[PDB]
């Protein structure tokens, strides 16, 4: 079988020099491969063609700090002075003729994490129900959480100071530049909204809780 | 420059067909092969097939029984067709064109394989809370209870793009909810008009919501 093997993840300190490995199947150790860089839910970007003597051709928009090398079945992508912008999934690809037919295969991808970045406290934006939603006898509370780093957050809602869990609808954090974004919604009836004194969206990030409140008043 | 533009519906009922067109501008398909690739949530890239410049094809063996790729050179279009879709055919699908040394990519077609009904979103403008004074102001748009993904959300038909944060949809009880915010200076709004534009191709709905001070 034609198989590319990559570790699923790898971690490097800011400014360090990083090396990623892709290993070809033994009977295909002389093969030329492609490296790609991919952001979540986006088309991959072509990084380079890498041949068995370790020579390579880099694609457009790839900076000088990326280069390649080889050692038998191993193909390496090296990034010197690794930047936060280099956080991505890296994937190798290879083509062959197998039983008279063209086949192309991708590796599993390696997720690269760049350690030692500056911390960033979440920005909370809260919105009360629009009067249009209230005319449908409904009420949705919106909590938008942005500009934070690292990606670990927990969101908790409160009504009149009491934790509540019914109607809460929280997303996973997702990447924006080198920061992260998340949203949380609280689905209520207009009656629940109007009968309570306050609601609070509470965000914990690195043992720091930040919070904002909404009132029907 | 070279552009690959994909079109075709993304919602597919189980056992029905998926058709996608890739329209290529800025180069000629008499000279390049076009690959089809897909990525499903946390499952890695799968190569599907290719049509070479001469019109001959090659297919992933796991898909050849239900996959067909053809092209129209005079229109510069490639047609991808896959039959009998199942739940695990849910993915983003991309066309790609390689050259020495690089690749051009389509924008991707988000394909959802589901028997559930199409539901248009309810769109609500979000004005800041009363008592919100500083030099900047944050406005919002709530896009509630739609199916399936994707929705396309813009501000003032694209002519306001700075300070925009669009938060990815959350899914619950089989419906998606999404929000977007825009940050502008206090002197810009409400002196000047700011509208949320929301398009949902699957229900063929386009909605415009003006943000009004509360």
């Amino acid at each position: 079988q034609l198989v590319l093997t990559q570790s699923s993840s790898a971690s490097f300190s800011l400014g360090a020099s990083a090396k990623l490995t892709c290993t070809l199947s033994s009977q295909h150790s002389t093969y030329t491969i492609d490296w790609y860089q991919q952001q979540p839910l986006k088309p991959p970007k072509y990084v380079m063609e890498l041949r068995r003597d370790g020579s390579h051709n880099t694609g457009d928009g790839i900076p000088d700090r990326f280069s390649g090398s080889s050692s038998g079945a191993d193909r390496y992508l090296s990034i010197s002075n690794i930047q936060p912008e280099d956080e991505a999934i890296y994937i190798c690809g290879v083509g062959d003729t197998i039983k008279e037919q063209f086949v192309y295969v991708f590796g599993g991808g390696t997720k690269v994490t760049v350690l030692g970045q500056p911390k960033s406290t979440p920005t909370l934006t809260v919105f009360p129900p629009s009067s249009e939603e209230l005319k449908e006898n409904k009420a949705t509370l919106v909590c938008l959480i942005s500009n934070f780093s690292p990606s670990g957050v927990t969101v908790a809602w409160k009504a009149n100071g009491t934790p509540i869990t019914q109607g809460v609808d929280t997303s996973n954090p997702t990447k924006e530049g080198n920061k992260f974004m998340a949203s949380s919604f609280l689905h209520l009836t207009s009656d629940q909204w109007r009968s309570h004194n306050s609601f609070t969206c509470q965000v914990t990030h690195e043992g720091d809780t930040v919070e904002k409140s909404l009132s029907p008043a | 420059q070279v552009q690959l533009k994909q079109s075709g519906p993304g919602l597919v009922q189980p056992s029905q067909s998926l058709s996608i067109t890739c329209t290529v501008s800025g180069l000629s398909l008499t000279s390049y092969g076009v690959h089809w690739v897909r990525q499903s949530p946390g499952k890695g890239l799968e190569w599907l097939g290719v049509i070479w410049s001469g019109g001959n094809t090659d297919y992933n063996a796991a898909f050849i029984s239900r996959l067909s790729i053809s092209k129209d050179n005079s229109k510069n279009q490639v047609f991808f067709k896959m039959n009998s879709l199942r739940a695990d055919d849910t993915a983003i699908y991309y066309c790609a064109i390689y050259y020495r040394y690089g690749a051009y990519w389509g924008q991707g077609t988000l394909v959802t394989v589901s028997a559930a009904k199409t539901t248009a979103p309810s769109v609500y403008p979000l004005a800041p809370v009363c008592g919100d004074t500083g030099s900047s102001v944050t406005l919002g748009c709530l896009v509630k209870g739609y199916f399936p993904k994707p929705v396309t959300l813009t501000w003032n038909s694209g002519s306001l793009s700075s300070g925009v944060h669009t938060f990815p949809a959350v899914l619950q009880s089989d419906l998606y909810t999404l929000s977007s915010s825009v940050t502008v200076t206090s002197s810009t709004w409400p002196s000047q008009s700011i509208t949320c534009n929301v398009a949902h191709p699957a229900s063929s709905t386009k909605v415009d919501k003006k943000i009004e001070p509360r």
Binding site: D96, Y104 | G33, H35, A103
Partner: peptide, 9 residues
């Protein structure tokens, strides 16, 4: 020596 197939032509 075999070097595989390229995705471009």
């Amino acid at each position: 020596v075999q070097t595989g197939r390229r995705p471009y032509e």
